[PDB]
């Protein structure tokens, strides 16, 4: 057993628990894409940890979050490695799942560096099998993940819907505090599913193209990112942050004046997973028992510092990194 | 420990080396082969063992050969996978040597199932440290797995070309018969460093086009075939077999006659790793004493049952399967 064992009294029992996707980025760099028919020879090769479950949790983690990552994965090799690496950043692995039956879930990533232009397929494998019913079988109708000690919840879009809207439903019921980022952006027959579900939602956390499709406000600014707001409130959405990507984030905080803060000025290299950074860091940061805002704005240098680096979770902060007063 | 250990007595030492390659293949099926800057989604995943090396090692080893595999894998769980797979194929996994510094080998394959055209990039990853001054320092200057006993070595041209010219020499000069399939198609440069290390070859046993590139002798039939094989005695090679698909295939014992055995009539359905079926068929019935020949008329046998699957190895047959009269 790679994963880790809960013990009888609960004494490891996470803070924040994450339900959502586990995703291997396998990245090969060529020089130019392969056109129909082609065998050819990659350059250069990278493995990388991904999954936007994955990468909140481990933002969490390597800033010391008690965090537990829910999510399947293949009892395949990648998922013994994806397990492992999880570990090593500060995540509780007890409650991964494992089937024979599919592949750990990955990505295929094809990167000409020359024209720095991209071909992704994503496999989602094991993920799709990540269904409500199997996970209340296997966590006796939530009861094994949802302990009362648990203070959040952080879900995402890249598990089968019915999961991540029936997880947040039920934490939600039970006084847990959830926190939903709907990425990757909900399809239209997605938007009018979780509607429904957003006053269970405590905190709804979307770039702007998510709360575009979600609000119908065509969010491109710091005023219609605050009309945003206001859609996502009547929805039935308590606290509700909009990732601005360089021009930051705006908040309010249980229906409280909104707030805009700036991106941080910092050299953007690569912001391949900045969201998740900021996602992952603004919940170990209530959870360290700052507000939203106090929480947000830790997030937002998280976020910021992650953007100067490449390689997604290799950019997430360690502590030592920040600035005085940010942890 | 995954991999298998030898004894100090030698009592496991197999009959047939086969030092090349093990490649995880990664196959995603996808709607249309990704555009530039395209993101998609697979429709499906399947996750393959492959590599020509280890596809030729477990076609031996499924029809029951005592053979070994010698390779570069990573520490990863890929790697951990593969070792595993092959001992399951009945392929003894000893001289696996195994990276912390490279991922296992792999190809990324998109299939798109409609046109059933493929785009595959390859990532030898931890293949391209598999060098001769790696081997012999792991082996005693190839000692450890040149034992007096060795019947057989097979060699591809899917890992660093002076480890596969380097072993046949010495394989050669211990009194071992070398198999080469120069699979992939050698390039101009490597049919130049090639030639001078065809008298160490006992078998070459090419395709169509490797037969073409080797001699200059452009192979389309049975003639042309002829005359590639003369060129190849030519060349230093006792024993010659060139595989012609559909069309079975022609051979030369020791500077006899050509003969041509004609294909198997059956219904292709998935050609993959046919050749390498035929190659590691071909030697395990060497070893159990056949002359080339015999040994080809059953390869011939094996490899035309392999295409009426899908699968690669999983369509390599096991001897309970074959009709009466193969085995
Ligand atoms: N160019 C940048 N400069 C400074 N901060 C940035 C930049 N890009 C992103 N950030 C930081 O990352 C956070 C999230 O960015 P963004 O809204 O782009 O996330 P996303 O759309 O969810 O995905 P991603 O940022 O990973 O592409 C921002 O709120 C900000 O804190
Ligand atoms: N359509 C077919 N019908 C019958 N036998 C086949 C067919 N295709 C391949 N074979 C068998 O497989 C052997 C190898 O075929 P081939 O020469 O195509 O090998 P290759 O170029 O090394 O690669 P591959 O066979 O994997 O495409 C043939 O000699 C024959 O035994
Ligand atoms: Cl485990
Ligand atoms: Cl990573
Ligand atoms: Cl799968
Ligand atoms: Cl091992
Ligand atoms: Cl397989
Ligand atoms: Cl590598
Ligand atoms: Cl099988
Ligand atoms: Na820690
Ligand atoms: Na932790
Ligand atoms: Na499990
Ligand atoms: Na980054
Ligand atoms: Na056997
Ligand atoms: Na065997
Ligand atoms: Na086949």
């Not at 995540?91 to 990955?106: C, I, N, P, Q």
């Not at 269904?131 to 952080?154: D, F, M, S, V, W």
């Not at 309010?252 to 997973?273: F, I, L, M, Q, W």
Request: some cysteine; aromatic content about 8%; overall charge neutral.
């Amino acid at each position: 057993r790679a994963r880790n064992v809960r013990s009888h009294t609960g004494e490891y029992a996470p803070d924040i628990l994450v339900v959502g996707s586990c995703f291997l980025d396998y990245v090969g760099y060529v020089d130019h894409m392969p056109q129909v028919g082609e065998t050819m020879h990659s350059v250069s090769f990278h493995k990388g940890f991904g999954g936007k479950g994955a990468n909140q949790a481990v933002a969490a983690g390597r800033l010391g979050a008690k965090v537990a990552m829910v999510s399947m994965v293949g009892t395949d090799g990648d998922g013994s490695d994806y397990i492992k690496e999880l570990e090593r950043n500060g995540v509780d692995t007890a409650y991964m799942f494992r089937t024979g039956k599919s592949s750990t879930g990955l990505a295929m990533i094809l990167v000409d560096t020359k024209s720095s232009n991209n071909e992704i397929v994503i496999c989602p494998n094991a993920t799709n099998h990540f269904t409500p019913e199997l996970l209340r079988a296997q966590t006796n109708n939530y009861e094994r993940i949802l302990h009362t000690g648990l203070k959040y919840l952080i879900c995402q879009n890249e598990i089968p819907l019915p999961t991540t809207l029936d997880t947040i439903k039920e934490a939600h019921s039970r006084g847990v505090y959830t926190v939903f980022n709907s990425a990757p952006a909900p399809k239209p027959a997605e938007v009018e599913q979780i509607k429904p579900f957003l006053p269970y939602v405590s905190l709804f956390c979307p770039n702007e193209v998510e709360a575009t499709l979600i609000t119908g406000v065509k969010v491109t600014d710091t005023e219609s990112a605050f009309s945003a707001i206001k859609a996502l409130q009547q929805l039935g959405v308590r606290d509700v942050v909009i990732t601005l990507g360089a021009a930051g984030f705006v908040l309010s905080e249980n229906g409280a004046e909104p707030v805009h803060v700036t991106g941080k000025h910092v050299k953007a290299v690569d912001t391949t997973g900045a969201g998740d950074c900021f996602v992952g860091s603004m919940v170990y940061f209530m959870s360290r028992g700052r507000n939203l805002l106090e929480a947000c704005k830790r997030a937002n240098e998280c976020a910021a510092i992650s953007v100067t680096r490449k390689g997604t979770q290799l950019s997430y902060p360690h502590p030592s990194e920040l600035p005085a007063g940010v942890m």
